[PDB]
């Protein structure tokens, strides 16, 4: 609700996050583009030259091997359904290892959900 | 004169330790310049300060993940309590996970997760990303579930090697043997001890959801991080001597030859602000790493064993501990054996029988006023003074304070033939 | 503007904390930290503490005079060594420096 | 100059806090008990 | 072959540990500026350092 003498509107960092059109006096809402940071999941260059790419904190509608995780959208790695130990950590329980799946129809980077450990159940009894 | 306790109180205590902090990650060029290029070409002149700051923050974040891995991942495997829970009378339902919820946290972990109140948008648009922890809380709360299900069912032996089942009523007898109290003190007071444990856990539950400041350490860690980020944002509104605190009014109102000096003033100011932030975060991360190492040691010793280190695992003699996760921290429920109901007695270092000093094998010599007994040191249970609990090591003339009495040899009555 | 605030616990209170610790250790033993202090003769507290290090009680009850003399002599030597050498408290002096 | 002073005092205070935690542990274990941790409470077997 | 002690010596040892340090507190405006106002209005530009 801009008062008649209020043209702009600032945040704590003194950057305008609301403006009013000088022709039609409507209240706009300035917001910078959907920026972010890119991480590159990669096995050793000795082992392979294929890299998965993680767009951190980005819903990747911004643009098959597309995986959306709480850490961001991971592009280049297939989401396997089982769980292994953690080799490269991505975040929010999602890891990613370079596993030769079958040595034929293979050479891919996978992205599973980290496994905590071998499930167990002690045979407790009162005697 | 000696005083020997005649009863005891099981007293569950709580202890909150911070384990990690938020994995913030401040981009450097976006914060200092903000998608400007005239600014970035002048920021390139300052060498690799941006790379150094990003390296420091990434090291801090990796350290924060290592802290959680070190503290909670003490279990090789993942244990489950059996569906039939006949734990000798003790009621761990407030500690064991509630399967009803999607997040398999227990009741006490639920109470702990509501008292830490973890603006947060306007930070983001200046490169102030906040990375997510590697172990989501549904994974940490499964580590702690495994630790609880191994402590309850196996004992301290699930940390040494493979879990070894043992009745909880017998693990508790071991844990009294540890503090110097014999087994017949639990096997004859099992109902009372179970009631005291249940009441202490209920009191912990009542105290958690009564007072908001139960988790002040975690809340203050969160407050420090949030306040550092808030002042880092607020530092973007300072001129630092320039004609304006926004680059889009310097560039759009000055030709580069004389806009360069104002841009450089803002570069120096914002770079100093970011360096101050990074340095203080490094010191804070050192604090949190010390606290996480302490929490890891507390887990390894209190939870996976039974510590003789005084006041390490709560006030009193330590029986066992239970780990409960908490936002950016861990909570230990130190079950401790506290003696109570004292009673003054009359003691004696030894006892002369045949001009031979008799010392107590394990225990104390006391007297109700006229008759001499030999009890334990931490619980009044007076046996009669035989030669199976006293050892002869000399003569009646060397000990200072030795008293006269009779040591009843059991074998001579058994030779009544 | 270089103010130096005073400590909250004045040294006459720190010297009362340490006095309480000493008077609990001497009279009760290790049991004044667990719960309520439980009195015990010091000749028997030190016998407990001998049992703790794997030496039976008769080693102490038959050598109480010698052990007491060694303790008194060691404390006297500590007193003599403190008021002989200035650098006995080098850690605190270096913190202050 | 003031920022340098504050940073060095922060590091020094971390050092002193580590030493104070060590002193608190030494009190709780050596003084209020009898530690079996070797060389924690002086050279030799610890009495008090 | 085993060696077993036949006597003992009670040996009190000292151990000094720093617990705290002086609680100094440095004001800025008196240090950097020192009751000046032309200086304080220029120091206000540097934000909340």
Burial (CB count <10 Å: 0-12, 13-18, 19+), residue C37: middle
Size of interface B-C (CB pairs under 8 A): 73
Kindly write down the DSSP assignment for every residue of B149-197, as one continuous string. Answer: HHHHHT-SHHHHSS-----HHHHHHHHHHHHT--GGGTTTSHHHHHHHH
Pairing of strands A108-110, A77-78: parallel
Chain A residue with the nearest C-alpha to that of B69 = A116
Whether A75 contacts A60, CB under 8 Å: yes
Number of C-beta neighbours around residue A95 at 10 A = 21
Report how far residue B135's alpha carbon sits from residue B330's, in angstroms, rounded to the nearest whole number: 14
Residue D13's closest chain B neighbor by CA? B283
The candidate with the shortest Cα–Cα distance to D36, out of B18, B263, C53, is C53
Experimental method: cryo-EM
Which residues 6+ apart lie within 8 Å of A81 measured at CB? A112
Can you read off the two tokens belonging to residue C46? 């030190």
Cβ pair D32:B310 closer than 8 A: yes
Whether B145 contacts A116, CB under 8 Å = no
- Cα separation, B254 vs B248, in Å, equals 10
Query: Is B276 at the interface with chain E, CB within 8 A?
Result: yes
- Residue whose pair of structure tokens reads 């997040």 in the numeric block: B103
Contact flag B238-E47 (C-beta cutoff 8 Å): yes
- C42/B99 Cα distance (integer angstroms): 55
3-state SS of B238-302 is CCCCCCCCCHHHHHHHCCHHHHHHHHHHHHHHHHHHHHHHHHHHHHHHHHHHHHHHHHHHHHHHH
Q: Cβ–Cβ of C3/E21 closer than 8 Å?
A: no
Question: What is residue B380's three-state secondary structure?
Answer: coil
Question: What sign results for the dihedral spanned by CA atoms A99, A101, A107, A110?
Answer: negative
Interface touch E47/B237, C-beta < 8 Å: yes
Contact B338, B10 (CB under 8 A): yes
Chain B with chain E: Cβ pairs closer than 8 A:
20
- The single-letter DSSP state of residue C6 is P
Test E28 with D3 for CB contact under 8 angstroms.
Answer: no
Place of tokens 């002869």: B392
Partnered with residue B77 across adjacent β-strands are A118
Identify the H or E element spanning A90.
strand A89-91
Give contacts of D46 with chain E, Cβ < 8 Å: none
B315 touches chain D (CB under 8 A): no
Task: State the Cα–Cα distance between residues B228 and B225, nearest whole angstrom.
Answer: 5
- Spell out the long-range contacts of C22-26 with Cβ–Cβ below 8 A and sequence spacing 24 or more: C25/D31, C25/D32, C25/D48
Report which of B231, B216, B225, B238 is spatially closest to residue E47, judged by C-alpha positions.
B238
Strand order in the sheet with A66-69: A37-41, A52-56, A72-75, A66-69
Long-range contacts of B259-263 (CB under 8 A, 24+ apart): B259/B38, B260/B42, B263/B38, B263/B39, B263/B42
Q: Do C91 and E25 touch (CB under 8 A)?
A: no
Quote the CA–CA distance of B67 and B73 in Å, as a whole number.
10
Instruction: Return the residue of D nearest to C48 by Cα.
Output: D47
E18, E24, E32 member nearest D2 (Cβ)? E32
Instruction: Determine contact, residues B343/B380, Cβ cutoff 8 Å.
Output: yes
With CA atoms as reference, the chain D residue closest to B315 would be D28
CA dihedral angle for residue C59, residue C61, residue C63, residue C64, rounded to 10 degrees: 140
Residue (of A16, A63, A21, A15) closest to A38 by Cα position: A63
Interface partners of B (3+ CB pairs, < 8 Å)? A, C, D, E
Strand partners, A68: A73
Write the CB contacts of D4 (distance below 8 Å, at least 6 apart in sequence). Answer: none
What is the C-alpha separation between B382 and B360, in angstroms, rounded? 12
**Partner-chain contact B75 A56, CB within 8 Å:** no
What are the chain D neighbours of C32 within 8 Å (beta carbons)? 32
Retrieve residue B400's tokens.
């200072």
Number of Cβ within a 10 Å radius of residue B74: 19
Q: Which residue has the tokens 């172990």?
A: B135
Interface contact A12-B230, CB threshold 8 A: yes
Q: Which pairing describes strands B372-375 and B364-367: parallel, antiparallel, or unpaired?
A: antiparallel
Pair of tokens at residue C87: 């650098």
Q: Residue E7 to residues B39, B330, C66: CA-CA distances in angstroms?
A: 79, 49, 11
Q: Compute the distance between CA of residue B43 and CA of residue B269 in angstroms, rounded to an integer.
A: 12
Q: Is D5 on the interface with E (CB under 8 A)?
A: yes
Report which of B84, B32, B112, B96 is spatially closest to residue B328, judged by C-alpha positions: B112
Give which of B3, B181, B364 to mutate to test C binding, by max C Cβ within 10 Å. B3
The whole-angstrom separation of Cα B405 and Cα B360 is 13
Residue B151 CA from chain centroid, whole number: 15
Closest CA to B190 of B210, B209, B167: B167
Distant-in-sequence, close-in-space partners of B214: CB < 8 Å, separation ≥ 6:
B14, B16, B115, B207, B208
8 Å CB contact between B373 and B384: yes
Task: Tell me how far the alpha carbon of residue B357 is from its chain's centroid.
Answer: 47
> Strand B364-367 and strand B383-384: pairing?
unpaired
Q: Using a CB-CB distance cutoff of 8 angstroms, which residues of chain C are in contact with residue B349?
A: 41, 43-44, 47, 57, 61
Distance CA B234, CA B45 (A): 25
Of the partner residues C25, C49, C52, the one whose CB lies closest to the CB of residue D31: C25
Phi, psi (rounded to 5 degrees) for B361: -60, -65
- Strands of the sheet with A77-78, listed across from one edge: A77-78, A108-110, A98-99
Pull the structure tokens for residue B17: 């330790």
Q: Residue B339: which of B377, B310, B301 has the closest Cα? A: B377
C34 vs E35: CA distance, rounded Å: 55
Distance from CA of B239 to the nearest CA of E (A): 6
In 3D, which of A78, A85, A82, A87 has the Cα closest to residue A108? Answer: A78
Chain A residues whose CB is inside 8 A of the B187 CB are none
> What is the helix (H) or strand (E) element at residue A78, kind and residue range?
strand A77-78
Q: How far apart are CA C48 and CA C30, in angstroms?
A: 10
Per the listing, tokens 């009670």 go with E10
B157 near A82, Cβ under 8 Å?
no
Structure's resolution in angstroms: 3.2
Residues 6+ apart with CB under 8 A from B127: B26, B27, B28, B29, B30, B31
A12: nearest CB among B81, B122, B133? B122
Residue C91, C-beta contacts closer than 8 angstroms, at least 6 positions apart: E16, E17, E18
Q: Which residues of B touch A119 (CB under 8 A)?
A: 77-78, 80
Residues 10-49 of E with CB under 8 A from C: 10-12, 14, 16-18, 20-31
Unique residue bearing structure tokens 């104390």 = B364
Residue B266 in contact with partner chain E when CB distance is under 8 A = no
Distances (CA, A) of C88 to A54, A89, B217: 59, 51, 37
- Distance from the Cα of E19 to chain C's closest Cα (Å) equals 9
State both tokens at B315: 């006030």
Nearest C-alpha in E relative to C68: E10
Interrupted after residues, chain E (C–N over 2.5 Å):
none
> Parallel, antiparallel, or unpaired for β B403-404 and B317-326?
unpaired
The rounded distance, in Å, linking the Cα atoms of B131 and B287 is 20
Chains contacting E (3 or more CB pairs within 8 Å): B, C, D
Distance from CA of E3 to the nearest CA of B (A): 22
Q: Using a CB-CB distance cutoff of 8 angstroms, which residues of chain C are in contact with residue D45?
A: 53-54
């Amino acid at each position: 609700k801009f008062l008649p003498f209020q043209q702009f509107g600032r945040d704590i960092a003194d950057t305008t996050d609301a403006v009013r059109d000088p022709q039609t006096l409507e209240i706009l809402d300035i917001t910078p583009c959907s920026f972010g940071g890119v991480s590159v999941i990669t096995p050793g260059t000795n082992t392979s030259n294929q890299v998965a790419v993680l767009y951190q904190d980005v819903n990747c509608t911004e643009v098959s091997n597309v995986f959306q995780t709480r850490a961001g959208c991971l592009i280049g790695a297939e989401h396997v359904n089982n769980s292994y130990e953690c080799d490269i950590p991505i975040g929010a329980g999602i890891c990613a290892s370079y596993q030769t799946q079958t040595s034929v129809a293979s050479q891919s980077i996978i992205a599973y959900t980290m496994s905590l450990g071998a499930e167990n159940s002690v045979a407790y009894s009162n005697n | 004169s000696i005083a020997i306790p005649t009863n005891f109180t099981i007293s569950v205590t709580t202890e909150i330790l911070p384990v990690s902090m938020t994995k913030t990650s401040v981009d450097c060029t976006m914060y200092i310049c903000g998608d400007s290029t005239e600014c970035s070409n002048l920021l390139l002149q300052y060498g690799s300060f941006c790379t150094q700051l990003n390296r420091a923050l990434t090291g801090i974040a990796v350290e924060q993940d290592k802290n959680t891995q070190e503290v909670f991942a003490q279990v090789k495997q993942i244990y489950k309590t059996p569906p039939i829970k006949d734990f000798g009378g003790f009621n761990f339902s407030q500690i064991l996970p509630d399967p009803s919820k999607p997040s398999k946290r227990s009741f006490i972990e639920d109470l702990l997760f509501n008292k830490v109140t973890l603006l947060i948008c306007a930070q983001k648009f200046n490169g102030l990303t906040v990375l997510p922890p590697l172990l989501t809380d549904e994974m940490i709360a499964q580590y702690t579930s495994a630790l609880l299900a191994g402590t309850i069912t196996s004992g301290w032996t699930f940390g040494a090697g493979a879990a070894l089942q043992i009745p909880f009523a017998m693990q508790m007898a071991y844990r009294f043997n540890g503090i110097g109290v014999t087994q017949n003190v639990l096997y004859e007071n099992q109902k009372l001890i179970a009631n005291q444990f249940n009441s202490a856990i209920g009191k912990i539950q009542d105290s958690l959801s009564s007072t908001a400041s139960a988790l002040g350490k975690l809340q203050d860690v969160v407050n420090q991080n949030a306040q550092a980020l808030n002042t880092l944002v607020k530092q973007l509104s300072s001129n630092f001597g320039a004609i304006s605190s926004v680059l889009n009014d310097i560039l759009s109102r000055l030709d580069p030859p004389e806009a360069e000096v104002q841009i450089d003033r803002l570069i120096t100011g914002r770079l100093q602000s970011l360096q101050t932030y990074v340095t203080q975060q490094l010191i804070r991360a050192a604090e949190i790493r010390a606290s996480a190492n302490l929490a890891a040691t507390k887990m390894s010793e209190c939870v996976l064993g039974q510590s003789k280190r005084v006041d390490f695992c709560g006030k009193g003699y330590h029986l066992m501990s239970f780990p409960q996760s908490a936002p950016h921290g861990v909570v230990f429920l130190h079950v401790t054996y506290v003696p109570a109901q004292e009673k003054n007695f009359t003691t004696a270092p030894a006892i002369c029988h045949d001009g031979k000093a008799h010392f107590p094998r394990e225990g104390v010599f006391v007297s109700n006023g006229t008759h001499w007994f030999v009890t334990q040191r931490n619980f009044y249970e007076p046996q009669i003074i035989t030669t199976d609990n006293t050892f002869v090591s000399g003569n009646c003339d060397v000990v200072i304070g030795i008293v006269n009495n009779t040591v009843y040899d059991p074998l001579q009555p058994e030779l009544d033939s």
